[PDB]
Design a protein around this ligand. Structure first.
Ligand SMILES: *Cc1c(COP(=O)(O)O)cnc(C)c1O
Ligand SMILES: *Cc1c(COP(=O)(O)O)cnc(C)c1O
Lengths: 422, 420
């Protein structure tokens, strides 16, 4: 009882230094700056917003109104939505909320299959599996990795869906939210876009542009590809002002998270274009250099995103499985995932066909083309060649430790720094 | 100008504490977090993801985490003495929702405490209107505030579920009365312990899981000093049931739960010492309250068995106002209170109010300090002393001792830490 909190402290600092020494390439992982990380630990855990500023029923919320209004207006500026609500406590809550507002049973929810680039929300035992029920797979073709809009518009056409979503876990190139609009608007099927995975790239005016391309809704997690802490955010048309704001609370919040959200949101406001551009630029040539070192990286005719896709099974000179690489990588101080590919036979697996990576956190750490071209080395060494994994850890742990800094922010601190409250 | 924003809220943050450490905070849905708990919130865990239990991730790099999740789980076992627990839920409404999704179908009857009946939202629709629907209300007794047990059992006789707990929660709900009545109609029982459970961790209020509850869900905000999130304590039969029921269900916040590890850790040790004195001081609050001549709910029953004192602000000796009116009056008197709509409320503006002693209690203040709080409220409610000059006599109190007890290391609970 007594000594365990300092033991959690132990695995905490161990965590910190591990993350400093290791480089982290993960699709869903982004780093928080010091302003927002400090701000998340403040007393804003104390109170609650209980709905919107000016609508409270609880007292002492006065400052919370200011910060919430500030980030609402900030995102209203950034993503250029005519409405925004920052209340969702996570991305999945944002999903559940925009569903609960924009859908009921009455069938189709159109989204990617899980190995096909889906994420676990829309399908059952999750968001809209809890709400919408009624799910259908998106016409994803594995060769050029993206949705084929023809079959999509067809399914939307004769088979008459009431709602359609875009975005996902596997997201190499912008999904056709533009071409789907005709049939979607025809049947009375709304268009929503989960921005989470790409949420930063769109703020930096790269990749896709959902709202100008006809999307009525855009929502997602602020902790991935965007500098914010853990939580969700919703952005939409201004006729939904009284709708989605109602369907959150009782759809839900965590106020410290919203504050850090605001700070990181302004970091994204000022430094976002440079950041995002640098991110995709940190992606593409990483994929190329990785394709030089003998891997098989998919979309060889292209990625416009921050995430990269590798198929290990078909990749020769390796002849390993995905997790087979993933583990040794994890103890090599280069950490990625275990991820399915649309080619995968069936899904019950500890060992898929390949791996999916991302450049975002390293970019916030400052890494550029040279450094990721040097990431290609550490990556390649274990698969082809296959010299000792833990041997190159003494090399790698002394590599990433050089950048402790948080870039594309207004301050340069130590991102892996641990601060003693006691 | 964006360059000036991180300076903005970190001012409003260092002012935030500054308000709350000086102000006396009576809001019952809120609590103070210890430095040990608060420290883990800033850690790199903010960036991570871990899948179910124990490790079983579809990602990697969780090597240290597969242990810490298990640490929170064990700390939720040997504490509540529960056969199983899952600390993964990212919110009280997330935990609650995962429970509603666990055993139910759309259309399945769910017996729960209604909002006008004096219970929290998410028990009734517009969450709880998401997957399963048709929620029915417990028989209530406006006179003596509680559930009505006889008519409860008679009413059960055919639901799918039974729900207890609420934001307005004066008295322990009759779990045992609805226990044997639940099983023969093929229903189950889920106790929502959000506003209580930390008290149950300190062995007070009631003992739901041993009173027959097959699910116990709770928020780590209310009556739990610690992070934001939910927690689900259930039978060992339901282990992988609820473990799987969420982690497709809601996708993990690791920094917070890393704080929850500490939270539980000190919850085992100091749980009783905190829990007893919570109510023992709260009854001093209520006793002074009535000894001043106030009109307060359950005048006979000592106005609560819980941390929440409920004053009817309609038909009160000095009002001729809204309840929310006096709420704001005390608000800028730097006494932080909360609206509570009473069962006789036909609504923002309530008949009642709800007062927690939690933030005052973890600070380690006792009965006569609660007498002081009472007197502070009498400064306004009675003698019509200006709330702003009274605020000076408010500032002397909570600012005097700002250090929280009942954890391990006593620092300033509101102490601000500059990062960069
Ligand atoms: C990545 C992602 C998440 C991640 O979990 P959070 O709830 O955001 O913490 C959730 N939902 C969607 C749609 C995502 O893409
Ligand atoms: C207090 C309470 C909650 C709180 O959950 P949040 O995560 O804070 O929104 C939920 N349900 C009930 C029944 C409660 O009493």
């Amino acid at each position: 009882y007594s000594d365990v909190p300092k033991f959690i402290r132990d695995v905490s600092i161990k965590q910190h230094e591990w993350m400093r020494e290791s480089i982290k390439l993960i699709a869903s992982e982004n780093i928080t700056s010091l302003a927002v990380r400090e701000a998340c630990a403040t007393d804003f855990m104390h109170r609650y917003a209980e709905g919107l500023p000016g609508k409270r029923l609880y007292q002492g919320c006065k400052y919370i109104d200011e910060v919430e209004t500030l980030c609402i207006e900030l995102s209203k500026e950034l993503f250029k939505a005519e409405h925004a609500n920052v209340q969702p406590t996570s991305g999945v809550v944002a999903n559940l909320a925009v569903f609960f507002a924009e859908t009921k049973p009455g069938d189709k929810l159109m989204a990617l299959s899980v190995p096909d680039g889906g994420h676990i929300s829309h399908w059952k035992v999750s968001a809209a599996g809890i709400r919408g029920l009624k799910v259908i797979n998106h016409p994803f073709d594995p060769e050029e990795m993206n949705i084929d809009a023809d079959a999509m518009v067809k399914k939307i056409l004769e088979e008459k869906p009431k709602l359609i979503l875009f975005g996902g876990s596997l997201f190499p190139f912008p999904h056709p939210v533009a071409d789907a609009y005709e049939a979607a608007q025809e049947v009375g099927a709304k268009i929503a876009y989960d921005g989470a995975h790409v949420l930063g790239l769109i703020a930096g005016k790269q990749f896709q542009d959902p709202l100008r391309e006809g999307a009525e809704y855009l929502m997602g997690s602020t902790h991935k590809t965007f500098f914010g802490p853990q939580g969700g955010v919703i952005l939409t048309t201004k006729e939904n002002a009284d709708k989605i704001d109602s369907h959150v609370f009782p759809g839900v919040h965590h106020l410290h998270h919203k504050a850090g959200l605001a700070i990181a949101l302004a970091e994204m406001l000022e430094f976002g274009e440079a950041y995002a551009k640098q991110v995709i630029k940190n992606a593409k040539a990483l994929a190329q250099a990785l394709y030089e070192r003998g891997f098989n990286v998919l979309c060889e005719h292209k990625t416009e995103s921050h995430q990269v896709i590798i198929d290990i099974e078909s990749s020769p000179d390796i002849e390993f499985s995905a997790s087979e690489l993933a583990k040794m990588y994890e103890e090599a101080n280069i950490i990625l995932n275990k991820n399915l590919l649309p080619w995968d036979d069936v899904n019950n697996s500890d060992n898929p066909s390949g791996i999916r990576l991302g450049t975002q956190e390293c970019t916030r750490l400052g890494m550029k083309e040279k450094e990721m071209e040097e990431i290609a080395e550490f990556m390649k060494r274990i698969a082809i060649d296959k010299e000792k994994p833990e041997k190159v850890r003494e090399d790698v742990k002394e590599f990433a430790k050089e950048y402790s800094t948080i870039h594309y922010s207004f301050d340069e601190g130590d991102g892996f720094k641990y601060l003693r409250f006691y």
